[model samples]
Target: MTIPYKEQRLPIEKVFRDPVHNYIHVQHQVILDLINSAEVQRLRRIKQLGTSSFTFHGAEHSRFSHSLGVYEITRRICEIFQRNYSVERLGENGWNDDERLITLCAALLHDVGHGPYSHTFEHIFDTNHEAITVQIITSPETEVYQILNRVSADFPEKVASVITKQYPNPQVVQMISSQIDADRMDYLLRDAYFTGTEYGTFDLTRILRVIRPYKGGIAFAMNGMHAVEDYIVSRYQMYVQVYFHPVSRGMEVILDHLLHRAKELFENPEFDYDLQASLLVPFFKGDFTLQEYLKLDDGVLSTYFTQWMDVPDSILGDLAKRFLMRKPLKSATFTNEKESAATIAYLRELIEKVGFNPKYYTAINSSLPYDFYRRTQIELMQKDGSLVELATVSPLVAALAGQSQGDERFYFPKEMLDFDETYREFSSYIHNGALV
Candidate 1:
């Protein structure tokens, strides 16, 4: 019997040379076609780490690579499950081969909706990448949707539901979206490799060997408890040392304010733009379609920033120059909310006194939600075949769980350090022990 298109395998497996995964193997026709789709190709133009590249020069990796890494990891997971724990042998709760394609597709297209500079653009424009990702998968307008539809009319929605965490099978949903899943595993290693950091490193081989599917969801075997703990700690360190690095957040602040200023100028009646950033006008007006969203990438926004450098509005012009030129705002860590607020208010007054507008010149950047030790639970399948939360059995993980690991930073112009003698008394107040 001839196999259906979804089940068709390549005569010769395709391989992509990857730094993190070593090589990403593609055997299925559907997976190969999805990667070649226009929607997925757009990720090549969007950096995975966004402004973090400005801080870590080697961190110029793209979402395209990360997506492939995720897919590769998911593929490995499916292979592992099929070889060791097929539903035919272990019953309904075991790995269902039928879910492999949807899980892999969800893993690959999870971040497809991310626009240029991702989080910063999303914040300024009120766009949700997750929602956009679902739209891209399910919308008839996108090549991704069309390609997925080739498998079955509802295949695209099946893949999208996995991304959205609404897939019926907990195993499929958890494989891509769980706390200890393919997406996190891929990015931690990939980002660490690119940034030349050891913090994100963990025992992928051991973890893979230890992973098992249960009726509820995915879980690590009790023997791999240490490996799971190591992953948790590695994630904590990556967030603290790399992802939440103060300078990157400082750059993000500048980008945020720069876009805000441009939006304000565009909305003003009297301002005449030399070049009306046409690609961004819909976004500036707080209305944009999936097509318009797809039209943007890091390069597209950078082009607009270059044009804005010559705009008549000084704030917009200078802010654009700062972002494009890599002049990130200086930042200082603060512990006390009350003192930080008072100090920020005073600093703003001093900034205005020194001729810089505080509105565009200052920001408070916090690393919340990305807390080193969030309360998310990772379960382990014990030798007795009972599931237990990781932290309950692992003291190493328990030590760090629920403990906050980042600082609140007050950002300001680098020139603020050159304050005159009259304002010099506040120097200690600004440059105290918590400097990044």
Candidate 2:
């Protein structure tokens, strides 16, 4: 098959000024068009971290903004490769300048399919954001697809395949989805800045300097091993302190319950909201097209939340108030493996007695306490014209090569841990891991 691409730049290069990477460069016409597409722009209405803003108050940045940042970073890499290491000049280690547009497109549209409230909406609605991302790219209905296909009939699918990691070129896939990719790198630094945390901060400059594409995939020089290890540690810390913050998870529970309750209310024929609930009504019925799915965002859904506050259903109304008023469910951590099944059962009963619905108010979220820097060992080209895994050369990285950096914990309402006379029957389970 012929390499499908439109070798044209937009009449005017559009640019987005970014805080982390300075001015985000946009060169290709299709990328520019895709950014301007209504579907892609809808990302502006969805928060990057969902309810994470509750924990890191400054985390109100939108996915639209993050997408731009990712695109910018990818663009810079392409520039670096074209200038120093084009595939045409060097055999396998060089970057293909032709793939630049596709790489940038993949980065910009990667998160286009995320819904309002991010993960919670996906959890309650049974929508796979990744699948939806593919659908948005391949489905002819979306502006993203229309803009992409204008270049070639199969261009849209090709770009979507890159997002899905089915692209033939490992380099292209690695740029977007690998362990130490542009997405992870950008989000780490960006989130650290917005959340005001020092833990997520790392040496982007060092990683960028050492990052080089190789025959198998991308790899950093063994000299940059310490920097890569620092990134892995930073990511681990961010997950525990920011991404997996218990309070944020609790707020997510409230959001999930709130949306679920809204879905139920919309199902009842008696439910009434002044706005045209046409799109959401389908979603509530468990059937939503790409177009209908795209129609809902934080702003649009928040309007419904306001309307639902007055609905006859008390469950939904209460949830709406909780989510809107920041009354997040409280959570505590327990080693799932260490806690006995009987202990958990008794704790559930105790939680129910404390006026918290175990079903809606409780959940166990297990976080993996491991960090895999480069999913597969990455090879770096040596002066002798041979490629070798960086770990093979460094004892430090070898130490962390297979290390587990995380843990699993059972989550429940904070009341279970809080002192309550009503929970005396299960006090043993709550304290000292005793259940009798």
Candidate 3:
């Protein structure tokens, strides 16, 4: 069977009730099927913000929700493009309406491969969520692949190509993968809203109106420069204020250490505990199938954590309680210059003295490469159809482009900070140590 470059939209539109976008409209049958696939539904168990839920309290949102929001934004952008400049009317710079289906599908499935806790899990398990996502789309065993293949045998590969930025059409790839794409836009706005912060509100409508696919890539009209600027600034603020909040980082650190501790304990044959969760057993043994990986979610692991509450291991039990009850460790700001091993060692010593395991209590975190920094490498399209990086066009952005926007941090239980002024030795040691 010959596959058309573009598939036809279904006769009746399918709308998903969304809290952020209100209603995510699905016109393409491919997008609808992919959304209904088991692979996509599994995202419902993966938290969008991960351990940030401990700090934000209301950040209980999941990847499934964010995926729908991303798709919705893409859907809106497609409408804007078709109305303003369809492929037939305009030349090279015009929107190719034929690419709409693939773009939407990629947007919807971009984060599908993320495992439980996403980035944090990657840090511990050597798993790359983006790579896993590509695997899910191309792997024949996956429900996602099967559904996409139903449209056309090569459909799964084409959609996966978009995710990897291998698709021939620069416009479609950039819309989903660029420094300022629908995924980032939707998550930033949705995350900020759910966490009750104002930093992520950009004029998405204005951005949508201004965005157009040019010959080289995507570009926003000069008139929407302010909105674009706002988005950039909002991204900067979200990273510093919300995304990299010390409390959130501290919580992630705890979760990471907790999981690491469990992994260690599970391997010790003498260690006694219930290992009934089939999905976690492989990961614990350092080998996991894609299907096993898919079965592990925030809830499944959380249930395991609940079971861990009664385990004989004190450290494991305490970690599980803190995680389940949202008792995040406290953190203090630091920098590369101050993230010294001596400083960390002193903090750990102090934490240990206070009857807390240093492995579970003390952590150092750096927020480099978190997300959405205005980089010197991000190029914008000029009216004359030339490509110019953001830094070249806007000196303000250029000035901050390569500069790191976050801080290093040291985290420990909050009680350590208030421990009756008992040990001046450890306190002063921690206060004075430097990286050198």
Give one digit per residue, the lDDT tens place, for model 1 in 68-98: 9999999999999999988998896689888
What are the lDDT scores of the predictions, listed in order?
0.84, 0.75, 0.78
lDDT for predicted candidate 3 compared with the true structure = 0.78
What shift in Å separates residue 301 of candidate 1 from its native position after superposition?
A: 0.7
Pairs of colliding residues, candidate 2: 330-414, 369-405, 369-406, 369-407, 370-405, 370-406
Top candidate (lDDT): 1
Residue pairs with backbone atoms closer than 3 Å in model 1 (clashes)? none
TM-score of each: 0.95, 0.86, 0.90
Model 1, poorest ten-residue lDDT window? Answer: 368-377
lDDT of 2 by residue, 1-436 (tens): 4533476665677778777777887777677788899989999998887788878766788889899988887887777778877788878777887887788889999998898886887777778999999988888888888888888788888998898888988888988887778898888888888898888899888888877776766766666777877887798778878988777777887787777666665666676453345557777778777788888898887787777677766666777777787767765445545546566666777777766667666666654333334444243534345656555666655566677544444556545555457555554555443223
TM-score (C-alpha) between model 1 and the true structure: 0.95
lDDT tens digits, residue span 1-436, model 3: 6545246568898878876788888877677778889999999988898888667767899999999999899888888888986777778878888787788889999999898888778888878888999999999999888877777788889998999988999888888878788999998899888888786777788888778877766887766666777888888778877877777877787788878878888888887666455677887777888988888789988888788878888888888888888888876655555346566666577677679887678776775232323332364745555555555566666556767655666777867645545455445544432232
Ordered from best to worst lDDT, the candidate numbers read 1, 3, 2
User: What is the TM-score ranking, best to worst?
Assistant: 1, 3, 2
Lowest-lDDT window of 10 residues in candidate 3? Answer: 368-377
